Amino acid sequence: HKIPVEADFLYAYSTAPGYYSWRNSKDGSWFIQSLCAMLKQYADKLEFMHILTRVNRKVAAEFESFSFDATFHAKKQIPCIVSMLTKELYFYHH
Amino acid sequence: SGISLDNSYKMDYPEMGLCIIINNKNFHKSTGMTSRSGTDVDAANLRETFRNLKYEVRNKNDLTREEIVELMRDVSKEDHSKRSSFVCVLLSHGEEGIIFGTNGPVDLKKITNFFRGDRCRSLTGKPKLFIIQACRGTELDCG
Amino acid sequence: DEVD
Ligand code: NA
Ligand code: NA
Ligand code: NA
Asked: Taking a contact as any Cβ pair under 8 Å apart, which residues of chain B between 32 and 51 contact chain C?
């Protein structure tokens, strides 16, 4: 058996294809803020795809841009999980 | 022994693996790219989070496009035999398929190709995670 | 809030 050369990669993108991604100058980026919080809370409990799904939900629900420029005001973001993995991934063992 | 299931990656190697964090904040003036205020908060959060998962974290700041490619090449040529996984975090400006070094863009495919199953044999069959905080274009989601 |  050979393995595809693109197998066993996971790309956790902060945003959907074609879109801007948002970063707050005081708090950090919406995606990284949320990713770290969900890893802290769930890495000893949940499989990685389910952690990233909670990140999707948190970014989509809890963040909205504020801008004096109407073009950039009141905007939302959804991250984008791209998986070529072949197995479940848990950060703990035994 | 009893019945065995193989639905989960083996994560009990001696080491969890490397976590490479590329934190690009200041860009060369000639590129026209702004300073990414707030990115140091991200880099510190990631370092602590992956430390507590027992990753060997390496933080790198303000790398040129040439330095990004050489770092990834060099890391891909280490012996990962005793490591369960590999993680790379990219914090920068970007466009669809592209991330910026401090002096110009890098194709994401060039970075990830170093870790292909046929080019990094000590990571074959092990999970390779790329976490990317960067734009993928200029569309805005109105909600 | 800024964009990347
Ligand atoms: Na992204
Ligand atoms: Na973000
Ligand atoms: Na592989």
From this structure: 34, 36-38
Structural domains of chain B, ranges and CATH numbers in brackets: 1-143 (3.40.50.1460)
Q: Which residues of B are catalytic?
A: 93, 135
What resolution (Å)? 1.8
Run of H or E including B101: strand B98-101
Do the Cβ atoms of A12 and B87 come closer than 8 Å?
Answer: no
In this structure, are residues A73 and B85 in contact, taking their beta carbons and an 8 Å threshold?
A: no
Q: Set out the domains of chain A in order of their start, with CATH numbers.
A: 1-94 (3.30.70.1470)
Method by which the model was determined: X-ray
Interchain pair C1, A21: CB under 8 A = no
